[PDB]
Amino acid sequence: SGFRKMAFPSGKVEGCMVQVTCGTTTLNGLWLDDVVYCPRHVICTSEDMLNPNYEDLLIRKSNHNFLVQAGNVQLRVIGHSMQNCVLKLKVDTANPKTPKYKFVRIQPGQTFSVLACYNGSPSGVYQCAMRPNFTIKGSFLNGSCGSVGFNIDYDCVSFCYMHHMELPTGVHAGTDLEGNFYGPFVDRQTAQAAGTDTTITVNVLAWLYAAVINGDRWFLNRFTTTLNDFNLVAMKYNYEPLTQDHVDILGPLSAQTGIAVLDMCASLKELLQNGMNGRTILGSALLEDEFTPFDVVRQCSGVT
Amino acid sequence: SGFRKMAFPSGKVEGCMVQVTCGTTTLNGLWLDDVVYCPRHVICTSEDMLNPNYEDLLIRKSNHNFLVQAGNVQLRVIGHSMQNCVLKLKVDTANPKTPKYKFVRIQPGQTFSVLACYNGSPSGVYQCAMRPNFTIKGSFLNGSCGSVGFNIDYDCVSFCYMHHMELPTGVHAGTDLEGNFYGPFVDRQTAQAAGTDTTITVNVLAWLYAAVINGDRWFLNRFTTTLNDFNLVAMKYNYEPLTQDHVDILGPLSAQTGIAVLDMCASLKELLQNGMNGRTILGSALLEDEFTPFDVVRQCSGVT
Ligand SMILES: Cc1n[nH]cc1NC(=O)Cc1cccc(Cl)c1
Ligand SMILES: Cc1n[nH]cc1NC(=O)Cc1cccc(Cl)c1
C-alpha cells in the first residue's frame, strides 16, 4: 500500500534524447528511427521570437546547420521539414535504442510523465496532468524545450507532448509530436490568454478511491447525491461537470471499494463545501486531480 | 520556472533489475557486475515470516534454487551469501548494463528516487525522503521487495535503499545495499514501533526558497527570528531543531534570493503558528519537507 505521484520508468525515453543546435540556439530533440523531432523555434534568435516568420527563417537553414548530438556521437542530417511547430530532421542512422512507439494526442484531464532534459541530457522525471485549459504546470527552465511527455503500455511508448514555451504566467505550453499546439498557443514571445481552468472531477474522485484503498477513509460519509446536484456544487467550485462517461470510467474503483460513484461524489461535495478542516488525504491538504482512474488502478495493482 | 517532485531518470537502474525466485517466493534483485542483490526474505515461506531463522533457512538452499531472470534471459548462479538482510547471488555473467555506481548509507532527511518494480519489471518512479524516524512513505505492494532507492551524480548511481517490508501501519522499511536496516526494524512479520517522526525543517526552508525563486512569495513577511526562538516553535510543532549546519547548507539559496536564512525561518514560524489560511505554496496546501536544499538548487538550475 501507499500512494505516490508516480511517473513511468524513463529508460526508453532517455535512449531517444539528443541535443539539437541551430546557430546560437540549443534545445532537445527526440530521435526515433531515422528522424529527430524538435521544436521549430530552434531556428530562431532573440530578435526573431517576438513574431517569427518560421517559413522564412527555415529557408536560410540547410541540413548542415542543424547540429544533432546523441551524447558523444554526431548525427548526419540528410533532410529537414517543418510540420506545424516541429522540425523533423532526417538523419542517416536509425536510433538503435528506438523503442516500440506511437504518437498520440492526449485529451485534457489525462496524465503523462515528463522527462525534463537540458542539452539533450535527462535531468529528471515527473508525472503531470494536461490541464482542462491545455496548459501543463511543469518544471521547465530555459533549454528544456524539446523535452517530451509520454505514457507506456507494456513495451510501447506513446509520446503525447513536446515542450515548447513558458507563458508569462509561468505555466507551460507545447504540442503533440505532429507539432500541433495543445490549446490556443502560438510559438511567439507574446502574452497569450490560457482559458479558464477547472479541476478534473473524475481524477479527484479516482484519488478519493485510491485514498480509501490505501487506508484514508475519514472523508466517507452517510450521504449520497445525484449527477444534477453534484454538478451544481461542481459549478460553484470550478470543477468539471461529471458525466455518465466519467461514472463508467470509475466503475472498476467503485467495484473494488464497494462505494457507489454517487456516494463518493457526496463525500467530494462535503469536502468542497467544508474543506479538509486541517486534515490530509494521502499526504495532501488539497483535492488532488493529477491521477486518472486508470492511474489509480495501475498503481494499486502494480502494472509493470 | 515551476517546481515539481522530480525523480532522477530511472534508465540506469532499469538495466539492473532482475527477478529472483526461491521456491514459492518471487521478488526483485539488483544486478551489478556479477552479483545480484536481493532481500533475504526471498528464502522464506508464509509460515517462516513470523520469526524466521534465516541462517537455517539459507542452509537448505543451494545456488540452483535461486532462479534469477533478467527479462527473457536466465542467469547462472555460482555462489550465494547472506550479508545482514540481503542475499548476494554471484552470477557467471557481469551485467552489460552496469552503470558506474556506489553503495551509500543516506542520512535521515535526505531524498532519493525509488524505481518500484514487480517480477523484476519496472512499474514507476517517484521521489521520496527518508523520514527522520528511518521509515519511508512509499508506494509498495506485495512483490515490490527488492525495488531500490538511489541518487545520480552525472554518470554515477549511488544506491542507498532496498525495499524490504511494509509495517502494520502502512509505512515502509528497508536497508542499505549491505543489508543493514535503516531504523530499528527487523525482517519479521511482527508489529514494530517506528520512532516518533518529525518534519525535516531544513527541507521545508529549502522549499520556501524554491517557492520564492518560482514566484510564490505571499508568505514572506517583515519579521525575523533567532535559532533559539525558531527552535522553541519547531519544538511545539514537531519540527527538527535547526542548527548552524542546516543554516550553512541553505547558504546558496539564501544568496540567490537575498533572503537571510533567519528571515525565512520567521516566515516558517508564522506559517506554523497561523497555517496557510486556505492558500497554497507551489501547488501544496501543507509545508513540504521532501526537497533538500541540494534538490532545490539542482532543479532550479537544471543539472543533468
Ligand atoms: C523559460 C522556459 N521554460 N520552458 C520553456 C522556456 N523557454 C521559452 O519559453 C522560450 C520561448 C519564448 C517564446 C516562445 C517560445 Cl515557443 C519559446
Ligand atoms: C505489502 C508490502 N509492501 N511492501 C512490501 C510488502 N511486503 C511485505 O512487507 C512482506 C513481508 C512481511 C514481513 C516481513 C518482511 Cl521483511 C516482508
H/E/C letters for each residue in B113-154? EEEEEECCEEEEEEEEECCCCCCECCCCCCCCCCCEEEEEEC
Cβ pair A11:B6 closer than 8 A: no
Closest-CA residue of chain A to B126: A6
Q: Tell me, which fold does domain B1-14+100-197 have in CATH?
A: Thrombin, subunit H (2.40.10)
State which CATH number among 1.10.287.10, 3.50.50.60, 1.10.10.10, 2.40.10.10 fits the domain covering A15-99: 2.40.10.10
Q: How many angstroms separate the Cα of A289 from the Cα of each of A198, A202, B102, B283?
A: 10, 8, 38, 11
**Sequence-distant (≥ 6) Cβ neighbours of residue B186 within 8 angstroms:** B192
Q: Best mutation site among B44, B165, B187, B189 for ligand 2, i.e. most ligand atoms within 8 A of its Cβ?
A: B165
- For chain B, report the end-to-end CA distance as a whole number of angstroms: 16
Distance CA B151, CA B127 (A): 10
Min Cα–Cα distance to chain B from A42, Å: 19
Q: Which residues are bridge partners to B80 per DSSP?
A: B89
Distance CA B158, CA B294 (A): 15
Distance CA B232, CA B212 (A): 25
Q: For residue B69, give the C-alpha cell.
A: 531472470
Neighbours of A29 (CB within 10 A): 33
Catalytic, B145? Answer yes
Q: B261-274 and B201-213 are packed helices; what angle lies between their axes, rounded to 10 degrees? A: 100
- Among B205, B204, B179, B183, CA closest to B195: B183
* A40 C-beta closer than 6 A to ligand 1: no
Distance CA B109, CA B158 (A): 16
Q: For residue B259, give the C-alpha cell.
A: 533572503
B195-206 burial: b if 16+ Cβ within 10 Å, else e: eeebbbbbbbbb
Furthest-apart CA pair in chain B: how many Å? 69
- Among A136, A282, A168, A158, CA closest to A215: A282
Task: Give the mutation candidate from B121, B125, B136, B296 for the A interface (greatest A CB count, under 10 A).
Answer: B125
Distance CA B304, CA B298 (A): 8
Distance CA A86, CA A96 (A): 23
Please give the distance, rounded to the nearest whole angstrom, from the Cα atom of residue A79 to the centre of ligand 1: 25
Q: Tell me, which fold does domain B198-301 have in CATH?
A: main proteinase (3clpro) structure, domain 3 (1.10.1840)
Give yes or no for a contact between A263 and A224, defined as CB atoms under 8 angstroms apart: yes
User: Chain-centre distance of CA B210, in angstroms?
Assistant: 21
Give yes or no for a contact between A219 and A263, defined as CB atoms under 8 angstroms apart: no
What torsion, rounded to 10 degrees, do the Cα atoms A298, A304, B5, B7 define?
Answer: 180
Distance CA B202, CA B207 (A): 9
Q: A227-236 and A261-274 are packed helices; what angle lies between their axes, rounded to 10 degrees? A: 30
Q: How many angstroms separate the Cα of A36 from the Cα of each of A28, A42, A121, B285, B304?
A: 10, 13, 15, 41, 20
Residue B194 half-sphere exposure, CB side, CA atoms within 13 Å? 22
Cα dihedral sign, B145-B151-B154-B156: negative
Of all ligands present, the nearest one to the C-alpha of A179 is 1
Return the residue whose CA atom lies nearest to atom 5 of ligand 2: B165
Burial of B246 (0-12, 13-18, 19+ CB in 10 A): buried
Give yes or no for a contact between A93 and A75, defined as CB atoms under 8 angstroms apart: yes
**Sequence-distant (≥ 6) Cβ neighbours of residue B274 within 8 angstroms:** none
Distance CA A92, CA B48 (A): 59
Q: B293-301 and B201-213 are packed helices; what angle lies between their axes, rounded to 10 degrees? A: 20
What torsion, rounded to 10 degrees, do the Cα atoms B157, B187, B132, B123 define?
Answer: 50
Distance CA B85, CA B247 (A): 36
E strand residue ranges, chain A: 17-22, 25-32, 35-39, 66-70, 73-75, 77-83, 86-91, 100-103, 111-118, 121-129, 148-153, 156-166, 172-175
Please spell the DSSP secondary structure of B11-76, one letter per residue: HHHHTTEEEEEETTEEEEEEEETTEEEEEGGGG--TTTTTS--HHHHHHT--GGGEEEEETTEEEP
Catalytic, B41? Answer yes
* A46 C-beta closer than 6 A to ligand 1: no
Q: Which residues are bridge partners to A101 per DSSP?
A: A157
Strands A121-129 and A100-103: unpaired
- What is the radius of gyration, based on Cα positions, of chain A? 21
Q: What is the residue extent of each domain of chain B?
A: 1-14+100-197, 15-99, 198-301
Name chain A contacts of B117, Cβ cutoff 8 Å.
304
Question: Resolution of the coordinates in A?
Answer: 1.7
Cβ pair B125:A10 closer than 8 A: yes
Give yes or no for a contact between A123 and B152, defined as CB atoms under 8 angstroms apart: no
Distance CA A13, CA A152 (A): 10
Name chain A contacts of B116, Cβ cutoff 8 Å.
6, 302
Furthest-apart CA pair in chain A: how many Å? 69
Where do the H-state alpha helices sit in chain A?
Answer: 11-14, 54-59, 201-213, 227-236, 244-249, 251-257, 261-274, 293-301
Domains A1-14+100-197 and A15-99 share a fold: yes
* B239 C-beta closer than 6 A to ligand 2: no
Cβ pair B214:A170 closer than 8 A: yes
Burial of A152 (0-12, 13-18, 19+ CB in 10 A): buried
Cα dihedral sign, B206-B207-B208-B211: positive
Q: For residue B214, give the C-alpha cell.
A: 518560482
